[PDB]
Every structure is written in C-alpha cells, then in structure tokens.
Amino acid sequence: HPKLVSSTPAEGSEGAAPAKIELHFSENLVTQFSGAKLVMTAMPGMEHSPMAVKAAVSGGGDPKTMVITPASPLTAGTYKVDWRAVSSDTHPITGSVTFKVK
Ligand SMILES: [Cu+2]
Ligand SMILES: [Cu+2]
Ligand SMILES: [Cu+2]
After folding, report:
1. For Cu(2+), which residues are the binding ones?
2. CA 58, 10, 49: angle at the middle one, nearest 5?
3. Less crowded by CB within 10 Å, the N or C end of the chain?
4. Helices (DSSP H) in the chain: which residue ranges?
5. How far is 40 from 99, CA to CA, in rounded Å?
6. DSSP code of 17?
7. CA 60 to ligand 3 center in whole angstroms
8. How far is the CA of 14 from the centre of ligand 1 (A)?
9. How many other C-beta atoms can be found within 10 angstroms of the C-beta atom of residue 15?
10. What 3-state class would DSSP assign to 52?
C-alpha cells in the first residue's frame, strides 16, 4: 500500500505561502483514482471553520508525486490537504497533511 513518504510543505511546518503543494508517495499512483482536497481550517483573528480552497490537483512527472496548485496564492492561516492514494490492485489509502501559512 502507498504511504506518504514526504511533502512540501511538510507536516506541522510553518512558513511562507507555497506556490504549489507536492505529496510524494512510496508507490506509483493510478491518476484517475487518486486525488486530494485542500482546506483552510483557520485564519488569523477568526474562529476555526473548515472551508474548501479552490485548487487543481494533478500528478507530477513522477507517478509517485501528487501536485496540488491553489487557484490563487494562499493567505495566512492553517491548512490541511486530505489526499487519496490508489496504486494498482490496491485498496485506497487516505491521510491528511496540515501546515500553517504566515
Ligand atoms: Cu479561507
Ligand atoms: Cu475568516
Ligand atoms: Cu489493502
């Protein structure tokens, strides 16, 4: 089964707004069954409130890499990437990556 090897930004990281989010998995993904959603869970001065972020999701050049690209630059707040990794003849695997933008 594919598991999340690494990502940019990394889990728990705090830093600048990423132009795109990259997820690297241990196994090659089937593009049509794999995917992800980006959510803002919080922003400065306001209560926690999950909201889908307008973003596109595609495989990279590497079949083990998933790329999420926001429609517009991410503003300050906490974000989570809920991903769905499906390799060939394998049960779907899901997970969540969280990170903060300042
Ligand atoms: Cu928001
Ligand atoms: Cu708000
Ligand atoms: Cu399985």
Report:
1. 1, 91
2. 80
3. C
4. none
5. 10
6. P
7. 24
8. 17
9. 11
10. strand
